Amino acid sequence: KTKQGVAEAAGKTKEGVLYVGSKTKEGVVHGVATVAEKTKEQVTNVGGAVVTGVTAVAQKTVEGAGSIAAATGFVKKDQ
Amino acid sequence: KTKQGVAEAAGKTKEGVLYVGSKTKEGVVHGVATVAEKTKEQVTNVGGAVVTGVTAVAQKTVEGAGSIAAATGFVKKDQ
Amino acid sequence: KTKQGVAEAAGKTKEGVLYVGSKTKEGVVHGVATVAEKTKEQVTNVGGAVVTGVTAVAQKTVEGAGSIAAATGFVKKDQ
Amino acid sequence: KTKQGVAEAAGKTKEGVLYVGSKTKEGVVHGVATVAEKTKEQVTNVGGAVVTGVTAVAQKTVEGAGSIAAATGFVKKDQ
Amino acid sequence: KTKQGVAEAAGKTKEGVLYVGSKTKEGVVHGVATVAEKTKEQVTNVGGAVVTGVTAVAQKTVEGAGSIAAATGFVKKDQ
Amino acid sequence: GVVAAAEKTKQGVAEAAGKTKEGVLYVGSKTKEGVVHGVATVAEKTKEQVTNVGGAVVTGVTAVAQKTVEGAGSIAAATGFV
Amino acid sequence: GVVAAAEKTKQGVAEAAGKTKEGVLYVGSKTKEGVVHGVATVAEKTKEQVTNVGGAVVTGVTAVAQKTVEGAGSIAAATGFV
Amino acid sequence: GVVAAAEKTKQGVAEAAGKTKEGVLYVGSKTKEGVVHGVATVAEKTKEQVTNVGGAVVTGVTAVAQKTVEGAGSIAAATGFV
Amino acid sequence: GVVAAAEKTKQGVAEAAGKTKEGVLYVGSKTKEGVVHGVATVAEKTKEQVTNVGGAVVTGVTAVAQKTVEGAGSIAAATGFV
Amino acid sequence: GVVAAAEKTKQGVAEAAGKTKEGVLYVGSKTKEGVVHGVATVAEKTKEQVTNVGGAVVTGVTAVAQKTVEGAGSIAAATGFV
Structure with missing residues (x-):
């Protein structure tokens, strides 16, 4: 037998x-809070990747x- | 036998x-809260990727x- | 036998x-809340991808x- | 036998x-709430993709x- | 035998x-709420795709x- | 005085x-005001005896939502003497 | 005096x-005001005796949400004497 | 006096x-005001006797949410004498 | 006097x-105001006797959320004499 | 006097x-105001006797959240004499 x-x-x-x-949590994202107040953002992008948001991933x-x-x-340009 | x-x-x-x-959670995203108040965003994009939103993914x-x-x-240009 | x-x-x-x-949750997205108050957004896009919304995906x-x-x-231009 | x-x-x-x-949830998106109050959005798009809405997908x-x-x-231009 | x-x-x-x-939910989207109050949207689109609405898909x-x-x-121009 | 104007535009x-x-x-949204949910009572033997003269008496297993x-x-x- | 103007634009x-x-x-959102949830009572033997003269008496297993x-x-x- | 203007623009x-x-x-959000959740009572033998004259009496196993x-x-x- | 202006721009x-x-x-967010959660009482033998004249009496196993x-x-x- | 200006720009x-x-x-966030959580009472034998004349008496196992x-x-x- 094997227990995991x-x-x-x-x-x-x-x-x-x-x-x-009984409770079980595996690969769980819980409690993500974000606040942006009176924030100025200026972005100039030419062929790149810019991420300024909120990302929550559970797998x-x-x-x-x-x-x-x-x-x-990310920028991927593999040959 | 095998328990996982x-x-x-x-x-x-x-x-x-x-x-x-009994409760079981596997690959669960719970409780994502975001607030943007009086926030200014200016984005200029030419051929790139810009993400400023909220993303919640569970798999x-x-x-x-x-x-x-x-x-x-992301920008993918593999050859 | 095998339990998962x-x-x-x-x-x-x-x-x-x-x-x-008994309860079971697998690949579940729960509780996504977003508020935007008095927020200014200006976007200029030329051939790119811009995402500023809310995305919730469960698989x-x-x-x-x-x-x-x-x-x-994303921008995909694979050859 | 096999239980999953x-x-x-x-x-x-x-x-x-x-x-x-007994309850079972698999690939379920639950509880997505979004509020936009007094928000200004200006978008200029030329051949790209702009997403500012709410997307909830369960598979x-x-x-x-x-x-x-x-x-x-996204923008896909594979060759 | 096999149970899933x-x-x-x-x-x-x-x-x-x-x-x-007994209850079973598989590929279910539940509880999507969106409110837009006093929101200004200006969109200029030339050959692209702009999405600002609410999308709920269950498969x-x-x-x-x-x-x-x-x-x-999205914009798809595969060759 | 509140004035709004828009001239020489396309839209x-x-x-x-x-x-x-x-x-x-x-x-x-879901609202619950005065809600009784999930009440289980098991009583093997019970005996109720009330002697009332001009009053209000409530006796027994009661589940009241108001x-x-x-x-x-x-x-x-x-x-x-109201 | 509140004035808003927009001229010589496209939109x-x-x-x-x-x-x-x-x-x-x-x-x-979910709201719960005066809610009774999940009450379990087990009583093998009970005896209630009330003698009331012009009053208010509540007796027994009660679950009240108001x-x-x-x-x-x-x-x-x-x-x-109200 | 509050004035807002925007001229010679595209949007x-x-x-x-x-x-x-x-x-x-x-x-x-979730709100809970006056909520009774998860009450379990086990009483083998109980006896209640009330003699009331013009008062208010509450007796027994009670779960009240107000x-x-x-x-x-x-x-x-x-x-x-109200 | 509050003035905001924007001219000769594209957006x-x-x-x-x-x-x-x-x-x-x-x-x-989650809010809890006056909440009773998880109360367990075990009473083998109990006896209640109340003699009331114009008062307020509460007797027994009570779980109250207000x-x-x-x-x-x-x-x-x-x-x-209110 | 509060003035904000922006001219000859693109955005x-x-x-x-x-x-x-x-x-x-x-x-x-989570808020808890007046919350009773996890109360366990075991009482084998209990006896309550109240004689009240115009007062307020609370007797027994009570769990109150206000x-x-x-x-x-x-x-x-x-x-x-209010």
């Missing part, structure tokens, strides 16, 4: 109140090699 | 109140190699 | 109130290699 | 109130390779 | 109230390779 | 307003 | 407002 | 406002 | 405001 | 404001 990223909870009682719970992959979760603001 | 990302909860009682619950893949979850604001 | 992303809950009692529940794929969940604001 | 993204709940009692429930695919869930605001 | 995206709920009692329920595909769920605001 | 819009008072607006705008909201209200 | 917008008062607006705007909100209200 | 916007008062706005705007909010309110 | 925006008063705004804006918020309120 | 923005008063804003803005917030309030 397993949340196990067990509870036993006879009388009263019993609460049993979960099983049996995947060479995977890229995020690639933001 | 498994949330297991077990509860047993005789009298009273019993609560059993879950099984048996997938070479997968890209997000690719924002 | 499985939420299992089991409950047993004799008298009273019993609650059993779940089984047995898929080379899948791209999102590709926003 | 399975939500299983089991409950057993003799007297009282019993609640059993679930089985046995699909090379699938693209979303492609927003 | 299966929500299973089982309940058994003798006396009282029993509730059993579920079985045994489909190379499927594109959404493609918004 | 011109001129809007002028003296006074404005915006209202309430809901878009894709929403009053311009009045008094109660469960048992015993007033006299 | 011109001129907006002028004297006074403005924005209101409330909800977008994709929302009052311009009034008094209570469970048992006993007033006299 | 011109001129906005002028004398007075402005922004309001409240909710976007993707939300009052312009009034008094209580569980048992006994007033006299 | 020009001119905005002028005399007085401004911004309001409250919530984005992706939210009052412009009034008095209590559980037992006994006032006289 | 020009001119903004002028006389007086400004920013407000409150929440982004991805939020008052413009009023007095209490559990037992006994006032006279």
Whole structure:
């Protein structure tokens, strides 16, 4: 057997109140907050890449090699 | 056997109140908040890529190699 | 056997109130909020790509290699 | 056997109130809110792509390779 | 056997109230809200693509390779 | 004096307003006021005995949801000599 | 005096407002006011005996959700000589 | 005097406002005012006996959620000679 | 006197405001005012006996969540000669 | 006198404001005011006996969450000759 990223909870009682719970988070992006107030932006772009925004990427992959979760603001000119 | 990302909860009682619950999150984007107040943006683009917005991407893949979850604001000119 | 992303809950009692529940989220985008107040945007584009909006993409794929969940604001001129 | 993204709940009692429930979300976009108040936008486009709106895409695919869930605001001139 | 995206709920009692329920969501877009108040938009387009609206796309595909769920605001001039 | 003008254009819009008072607006929202959700009660043996003389009595397993705008909201209200 | 002008343009917008008062607006929001959620009670044996003379009595397993705007909100209200 | 002008342009916007008062706005928010969530009570044997003369009595297992705007909010309110 | 001008441009925006008063705004926020969450009570044997004359009495296992804006918020309120 | 000008440009923005008063804003925040969370009570044997004459009495296992803005917030309030 093999266990990986397993949340196990067990509870036993006879009388009263019993609460049993399990949670699992894998590849999760939570709580991204951004504020821009009275901000001036001037951009001049000629053949390039300019990124000034908000990017939130979450990826979960099983049996995947060479995977890229995020690639933001790049110039690729491979030969 | 093999367990991966498994949330297991077990509860047993005789009298009273019993609560059993399990949750699982894989490749989840949660809670993205953005505010822009009185913001000035001036963009001049000639053949390029400019990204100033909000991007939220969530991807879950099984048996997938070479997968890209997000690719924002890029120039590709491969030969 | 093989378990992947499985939420299992089991409950047993004799008298009273019993609650059993299971939840599963895979490739889910939740809670995206954006506000733009009194914002000035000026864009001049000549043959390029400009993205200033809100993009929310969720993808779940089984047995898929080379899948791209999102590709926003790019210029592709491959030869 | 093989289980993937399975939500299983089991409950057993003799007297009282019993609640059993299971939920499953795969490739789901939930809760996208956007507000634009007193916002000025000026766009001049010549042969390009400009996206300033709201885009929400959800995709679930089985046995699909090379699938693209979303492609927003791009210029493609492959040869 | 093989289970994928299966929500299973089982309940058994003798006396009282029993509730059993199962829900499944795959490729679902839920809850998209947009408000534009006192917003000025000026667009000049010459041979390009400009998108400023709201787009909500949900796609579920079985045994489909190379499927594109959404493609918004693009210029394609492949040779 | 509020003046808006637009001349010698191709597409011109001129809007002028003296006074404005915006209202309430809901878009894709959910509201819950006085809501009872998910109540489970198990009672094997119960016995209720009430002796009332000119009053208000509420007895037993009760689930009450109320929403009053311009009045008094109660469960048992015993007033006299109004 | 509020003046807005736009001349000799191709696309011109001129907006002028004297006074403005924005209101409330909800977008994709959830509101809960006076909500009872998820109450479980188990009582094997219970006995209730009430003797009331001109009052307000509430007895037993009760789940009450209330929302009052311009009034008094209570469970048992006993007033006299109003 | 508030003046906004825009001339000899290709895309011109001129906005002028004398007075402005922004309001409240909710976007993707959750509000909880007077909410009872997740209450579990187990009582094997209970006995309640009430003798009331012109008062307000609340007895037993109670779960009350209230939300009052312009009034008094209580569980048992006994007033006299109002 | 507030003046904003923009001339001899290709894309020009001119905005002028005399007085401004911004309001409250919530984005992706959660608010909890008067919330009771996760209460568990186990009572094997209990006995309640109340003798009341013109008062306010609250007795037993109680879970109360309240939210009052412009009034008095209590559980037992006994006032006289108002 | 507040003056903003922008001339002989390609992309020009001119903004002028006389007086400004920013407000409150929440982004991805959580607020808890008067919240009761995670209370567990175990009581094997209990006995309650109350004799009340014109007062306010609260007795037993109580979990109270309150939020008052413009009023007095209490559990037992006994006032006279208001």
